[PDB]
């Protein structure tokens, strides 16, 4: 396992748009187009960044092309973050996955919002953090993937990932 097999678990994959959780429009795996409220702003935003006349539609290749240049985005967000970067520094291989995986899904800012959870795990102090997570919202809307989100920083395992 890695991230993109991780994320890949976790996001689906869709070749329509579609709104996530959030609400917003979104396609392949987890690609955010717009936090706008209009289909069209979608629909444009996707055909500038897909570059041809998607109509709503991408290809499997497109999908594959974004998740790729959204997770290296995720991984630069973080190490350009004051308050993310030490902490990412500081874990395992597995649990900076989870981090990222977190970046990914709320952003960098949404992520840096959770203080004291970075501070615990900065920490090493697994439990209390998985324990702090599970008291977002998040936790309440992706309780399936935040699960498992929380028992990777907690455990240091990938078996949150390994179908048993």
Not at 93 to 108: P, Y
Request: proline share 2%; hydrophobic share 40%.
């Amino acid at each position: 396992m890695n991230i993109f097999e991780m994320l890949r678990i976790d996001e689906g994959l869709r070749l329509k748009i579609y709104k996530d959780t959030e609400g917003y429009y979104t396609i392949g795996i987890g690609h955010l187009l717009t936090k706008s409220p209009s289909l069209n702003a979608a629909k444009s935003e996707l055909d500038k960044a897909i570059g041809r006349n998607s109509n709503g539609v991408i290809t499997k290749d497109e999908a594959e092309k974004l998740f790729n240049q959204d997770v290296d985005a995720a991984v630069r967000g973080i190490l350009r973050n004051a308050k993310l970067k030490p902490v990412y520094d500081s874990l395992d291989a597995v649990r900076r996955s989870a981090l990222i995986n977190m970046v990914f899904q709320m952003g960098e800012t949404g992520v840096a919002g959770f203080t004291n959870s970075l501070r615990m795990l900065q920490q090493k102090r697994w439990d209390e953090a998985a324990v702090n997570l599970a008291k977002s919202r998040w936790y309440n809307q992706t309780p399936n993937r935040c699960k498992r989100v929380i028992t990777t920083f907690r455990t240091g395992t990938w078996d949150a990932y390994k179908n048993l």
